[PDB]
């Protein structure tokens, strides 16, 4: 089913996902406390669901 | 089909009710006084109907 997902990829230009991967890449190197990983994980999930143009 | 696979049955973008659920489960163990046991219920019942982007 995952392959079926990638099979289509008719957009490949998410404006919310690019932000998600940028911040997630920026975070890999650091020795993050789990506290901030748990928080940032939540706020990533909320940024990843929100409308692109809301304040 | 994508929404019925990645968003419905996929592991991404859980429903708002999951947010309700994670709160409810947090309540399931500790014994709250009956007094506040209601208030949370009404807050939930109002909360579900809300548009998520509303402040």
Swiss-Prot record, chains A, B:
It comes from the Eukaryota. Duodenum, heart, lung and liver, but not thymus. It is found in: Mitochondrion matrix. Homohexamer. Organized in a ring with a central cavity. The ATP-binding and proteolytic domains (AP-domain) form a hexameric chamber, while the N-terminal domain is arranged as a trimer of dimers. DNA and RNA binding is stimulated by substrate and inhibited by ATP binding. Interacts with TWNK and mitochondrial DNA polymerase subunit POLG. Belongs to the peptidase S16 family. ATP-dependent serine protease that mediates the selective degradation of misfolded, unassembled or oxidatively damaged polypeptides as well as certain short-lived regulatory proteins in the mitochondrial matrix. Endogenous substrates include mitochondrial steroidogenic acute regulatory (StAR) protein, DELE1, helicase Twinkle (TWNK) and the large ribosomal subunit protein MRPL32/bL32m. MRPL32/bL32m is protected from degradation by LONP1 when it is bound to a nucleic acid (RNA), but TWNK is not. May also have a chaperone function in the assembly of inner membrane protein complexes. The Lon N-terminal domains are crucial for the overall structure of the protein, maintaining it in a conformation allowing its proper functioning. It is linked to CODAS syndrome: A rare syndrome characterized by the combination of cerebral, ocular, dental, auricular, and skeletal features. These include developmental delay, craniofacial anomalies, cataracts, ptosis, median nasal groove, delayed tooth eruption, hearing loss, short stature, delayed epiphyseal ossification, metaphyseal hip dysplasia, and vertebral coronal clefts. This is Lon protease homolog, mitochondrial. It comes from Homo sapiens.
């Amino acid at each position: 089913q995952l392959k079926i997902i990638k099979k289509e990829l008719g957009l490949e230009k998410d404006d919310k996902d690019a932000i998600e991967e940028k911040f997630r890449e920026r975070l890999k190197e650091l020795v993050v406390p789990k506290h901030v990983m748990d928080v940032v994980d939540e706020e990533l999930s909320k940024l990843g669901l929100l409308d692109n143009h809301s304040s």
